[PDB]
């Protein structure tokens, strides 16, 4: 009884909300064509 749904949702937004700027951050370090 540890509320697996909310733990699942808050991690899965934080995976996806951090997978977007990581596309840009990996390009800024690489100095590619932004």
């Amino acid at each position: 009884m540890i509320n697996w749904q909310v733990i699942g949702q808050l991690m899965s937004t934080a995976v996806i909300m951090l997978a977007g700027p990581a596309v840009i951050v990996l390009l800024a370090l690489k100095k590619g064509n932004l």
């Binding site: 749904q5 699942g8 949702q9 991690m11 899965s12 937004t13 996806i16 909300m17 977007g20 700027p21 596309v23 840009i24 951050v25 390009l27 800024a28 932004l34």
Partner: protein
């Protein structure tokens, strides 16, 4: 809910319609990192 072979991924699916809003914000983040040029 989802079929029984897919009840596991019920948290991930709940996030999925939000993701098209995140492409609108991805443009501005990309314009910030390019320096708005």
């Amino acid at each position: 809910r989802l079929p029984e072979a897919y009840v596991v991924f019920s948290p991930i699916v709940d996030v999925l319609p939000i993701i098209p809003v995140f492409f609108l914000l991805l443009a501005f983040v990309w314009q910030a990192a390019i320096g708005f040029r």
